[PDB]
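Example 4.3 (complexes with small molecules)
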Amino acid sequence: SEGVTIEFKIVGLNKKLKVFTTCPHTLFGASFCAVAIEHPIVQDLMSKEIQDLISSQGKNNEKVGIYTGLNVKHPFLDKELPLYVANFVLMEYREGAIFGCPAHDQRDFEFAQEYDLPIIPVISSAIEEYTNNSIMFNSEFLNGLTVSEARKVIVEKLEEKGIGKKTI
Ligand SMILES: [C]N([C][C][C]OC1=C2C(=C(Br)[C]=[C]1)[C]([C][N])O[B@]21O[C]2[C]([C]OP([O])([O])=O)O[C](N3[C]=NC4=C([N])N=[C]N=C43)[C]2O1)[C]C1=[C][C]=[C][C]=[C]1
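Answer. The structure with 7RZ bound is encoded below.
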């Protein structure tokens, strides 16, 4: 609709992953990264046998994915996030790649529950016509800020480091 594009460093390689989000302020609650089945990164960084795993389609309506074997470095935390090929990510929409926040997104929770991924809460429950007064927590420099202030500060920090930009 109107979001931000974020670059993630792929661990042990000189390659990057661009993801699109409409909730950049929930970045400290990221558990995984997921790309579409038809994403270029599948043909570039993975074996041809990945198509055999993909066709095994079996669990429809259920959020399923395959761990690629690669991790991405979190931009602000000393930690890595696993990278998946997921059935619920659409290639034709934006970058065909997402970051997952299971504590505040139903689709991300269903995926994390299946693959035992961590659940990290970041919003404590209370464009310019209204202000969302829910407060950020577990989010380093975003702590204590309302959701509205946090959306602004995270974008300034991503732009300041050359790893994020506004995307219409
Ligand atoms: C879940 N819904 C959206 C609802 C709003 O998205 C939410 C998003 C977060 C949170 Br926290 C809460 C809601 C965070 C963490 N996941 O990021 B979020 O913002 C993006 C958000 C942007 O979509 P929109 O419609 O709001 O403009 O959808 C996710 N996304 C992006 N590209 C994607 C892609 N190719 N295939 C799938 N999903 C993608 C991203 O998920 C996904 C959805 C289902 C089908 C087509 C397109 C989007």
